[PDB]
Design a protein around this ligand. Structure first.
Ligand SMILES: [Mg+2]
Ligand SMILES: [Mg+2]
Lengths: 437, 437
């Protein structure tokens, strides 16, 4: 059924090259695009870049593209794989690479094929993608569950001015009754926030960062959080809207400690914090603000810190760089009681099947799963169909600005509309969306 | 042939609702989304908004959506229209609305149906959208012409801080050998500019405006243009990259004069410029920098300023708000020798048919045509196929950042690839791309 496998370079939302794959079958042409992160988990599967400093500042994907076209394609076509057998598709791809971290072909060569095969499979089966993905993952479909969108509204951290160390501040309309309502009220808080931001930080403070949130010179998480609370209140949405954070603590972890002044070029080791000290910051924030989720509070291999904090955190704790959507690392994180939610980024692992396994393992342990974009996204809408397919009840796909973000949120509106009464909104139950009766 | 017409609200790139329309035929479901401008020309066809302050801050499009579903749809289906006949599709739509500027139904209701019909028709014909649009406009297809992209890299004007009064500064890789090369070298100039900008103005100055350009607090057009020239040189593309401006001068036209300090609440009235005074500024820029296109140098109805300048410019002058993609205004502009290029915005006039006629009337007069996005865009890629089909040789569709821009740029990559030797890059001949042999 697959007659052609073809890759090209296209541009992600930051204007950097990435791999787009097209699979041709009797049912037509099926396209998937590979996303890209920044300051990525050190344990993520290989994102292969050309490193030709003379083109694209070394970020070309000509090499990965060649791997699709000259290596994967002729082997994939001749193998007569049934695309409906996602496991077979991905087992073949993994077998062809032959390395733990897809370092022979690149995860960005393999993933596009994995994802395109699933769209081709849905076409063959004459079902929408989300229905096929539920089939693949054996998720229940009566009712489907539409996710709470965790909307980035403000960014701090390594790519913003000011001293604010924490990376993502998100609003989650857990109190909304429908996904349509969630997106609307979230857009309204967003606009209220841009307005307040411009009034307080200047006209330019309205400009947006990579994920679409405002990113002005902010000094402390409390400053950011007071600001967001002000916007929520102004928009009249207190008590339908809660807050999520992504600390991205791996970006300020050095030598075993946490440097919150990691931007400040002369940081004093005397106030680099231990895990417990940093845990005390998060505790203070929790007491003061309506935070319902915290992601990467500690660094990607700092197990003792995660495990100590998790006992008493009492809210959703999400693993991103800790777990890297990798069933092996997820197993450890479960055993160590380090977290209770997986941030699922398909390109961290490089195949759909491994990503589905990642999610099944997390649900089995009573963990939640937040499906997630990358900071470098594209017009590809796969993750919208995925979060519904896996019935997780929560997605993180950016601010309600920039269309590499709206593209997913818009796909969710279409999915919501298509399903009518055969879908529920996750709402207060986002953590265990998969277990909703 | 058409069995259903259906509209829904989706979100544009700024997180404001807009209208998406799906047409269903024997060949599938065909989707179009309507973009949205800021500070729209007074002569533009009506964009109907709901004005319910308790929802999306009055920016809802539920009335327009209702217009499609309750009014257009039943009548359109019962009319048994041949979607291949775009003129028929559009004559039906405009004669249903019955008002000159589409104020009964809304241009944001009509346009979605118009565009979706063209996609439906390409499918019936078993041809790519660009080929069908060529057929519709009687454009030659041997070879097709790929456009030079005018890429936003920097903005000033009403929504930027600092004093800079002109709106858009674009780079145009006219010296590139292919579209693909154009997009690479353009991406490189953009990133070099982003880095130089963060270095000079601070990390926050790297955040992006609506169209994906940087928007630092810049004080003069010279400062902006010197930065761009620095970035071109740094990226190693001297000579191969030219500059375009959109002055958006209508936003600073007051009391018959032009206020270049319009962002100052106490701007000095005695320093406001007459048309000829302003023209002398543009002359200075034109001679000092590799500027090959200036858009909206004078206000939307300041006809005499345009006609007096145009004689003197010696470079492409583009009408955007003057002409509003309207054949009646375009005729006047041609008669008054006010410009020599149309900025073609399908949603300024509201149907594809009127838009083609606008372009045709332009080429007929020896004008160029620059196909254009709106500042509020979506994941919709129609205008990529339009610019290729109309054979214009130039498109303005954003910075190489934010996927409502890359979506179009990526679609052009695909088209270029698919056409191979049956396409040529407009390059230095962008102005008269339609007349390439
Ligand atoms: Mg993270
Ligand atoms: Mg303009």
């Amino acid at each position: 059924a697959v007659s052609k496998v073809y890759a090209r370079s296209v541009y992600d939302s930051r204007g950097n090259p990435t791999v787009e794959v097209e699979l041709t079958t009797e049912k037509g042409v099926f396209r998937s695009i590979v996303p890209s992160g920044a300051n990525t988990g050190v344990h993520e599967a290989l994102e292969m870049r050309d490193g030709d400093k003379s083109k694209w500042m070394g970020k070309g994907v000509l090499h990965a593209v060649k791997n699709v076209n000259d290596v994967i394609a002729p082997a994939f076509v001749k193998a007569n794989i049934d695309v409906k057998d996602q496991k077979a598709v991905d087992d073949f791809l993994i077998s062809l690479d032959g390395t733990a971290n897809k370092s022979k072909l690149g995860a960005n060569a393999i993933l596009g094929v994995s994802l395109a095969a699933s769209r081709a499979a849905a076409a063959e089966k004459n079902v929408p993608l989300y229905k096929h993905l539920a089939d693949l993952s054996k998720s229940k479909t009566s009712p489907y569950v539409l996710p709470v969108p965790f909307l980035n509204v403000l960014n701090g951290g390594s790519h913003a001015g000011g001293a604010l160390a924490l990376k993502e501040f998100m609003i989650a309309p857990t109190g909304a009754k429908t996904f349509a309502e969630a997106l609307r009220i979230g857009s309204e808080v967003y606009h209220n926030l841009k307005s307040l931001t411009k009034k307080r930080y200047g006209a330019s403070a309205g400009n947006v960062g990579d994920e679409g949130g405002v990113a002005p010179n902010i000094q402390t998480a409390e400053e950011a959080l007071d600001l967001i609370v002000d916007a929520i209140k102004a928009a009249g949405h207190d008590g339908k809207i809660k807050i999520g954070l992504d600390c991205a603590s791996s970006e300020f972890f050095k030598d075993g400690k946490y440097d919150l002044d990691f931007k400040n070029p002369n940081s004093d080791k005397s106030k680099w914090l231990t895990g417990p000290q940093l845990a005390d910051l998060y505790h203070s924030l929790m007491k003061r603000y309506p935070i319902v989720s915290i992601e990467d509070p500690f660094a990607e291999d700092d197990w003792e810190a995660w495990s100590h904090f998790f006992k008493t955190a009492g809210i959703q704790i999400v693993a991103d760089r800790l777990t890297v959507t990798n069933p092996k690392r997820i197993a450890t994180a479960i055993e160590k009681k380090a977290a209770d939610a997986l941030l699922l980024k398909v390109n961290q692992i490089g195949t759909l099947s491994e990503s589905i396994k990642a999610a099944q393992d997390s649900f089995a342990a009573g963990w939640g799963v937040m499906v997630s974009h990358r900071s470098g996204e594209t017009e590809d809408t796969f993750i919208a169909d995925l979060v519904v397919g896996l019935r997780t009840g929560q997605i993180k796909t950016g601010a309600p600005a920039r269309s590499e973000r709206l593209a997913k949120l818009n796909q969710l509106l279409r999915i919501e509309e298509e399903l009518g009464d055969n879908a529920v909104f996750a709402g207060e139950n986002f953590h265990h969306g998969d277990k909703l009766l």
